[PDB]
């Protein structure tokens, strides 16, 4: 899911203001998003993984210099590592 809803409207409304507004992301929303990323791999819902990761990365990319650039690299690392062990490939968003 994302927090309590798999709705991309909810996912988006979480991720967007999170990445843009929160000066210092605490580990608890960071561990919930990484958990779902790896779980969407194993739950055969890499459709929703596509939506979540592409939106998350896009905002963390366009952020100039913040923790969000390190969070970009961390979350994207762990998801692609599970995905290459499970599905045997690493989705490059580009």
């Amino acid at each position: 899911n994302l927090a309590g809803a798999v709705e991309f409207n909810d996912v988006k409304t979480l991720l967007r203001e999170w990445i843009t507004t929160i000066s210092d992301p605490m580990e608890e929303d960071i561990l919930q998003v990484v958990k779902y990323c790896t779980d969407l791999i194993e739950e055969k819902d890499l459709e929703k993984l596509d939506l979540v990761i592409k939106y998350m990365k896009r905002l963390m990319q366009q952020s100039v210099e913040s923790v969000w650039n390190m969070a970009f690299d961390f979350i994207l690392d762990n998801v692609q590592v599970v995905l290459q062990q499970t599905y045997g490939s690493t989705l490059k968003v580009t």
């Binding site: 994302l2 927090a3 309590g4 203001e17 999170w18 210092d24 605490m26 608890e28 929303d29 919930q32």
Partner: peptide, 16 residues
């Protein structure tokens, strides 16, 4: 108990 500095997703978590 969790949240560190007021969770943004974990506040909107599966909890009502």
């Amino acid at each position: 108990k969790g949240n560190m500095m007021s969770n943004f997703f974990g506040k909107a978590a599966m909890n009502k």
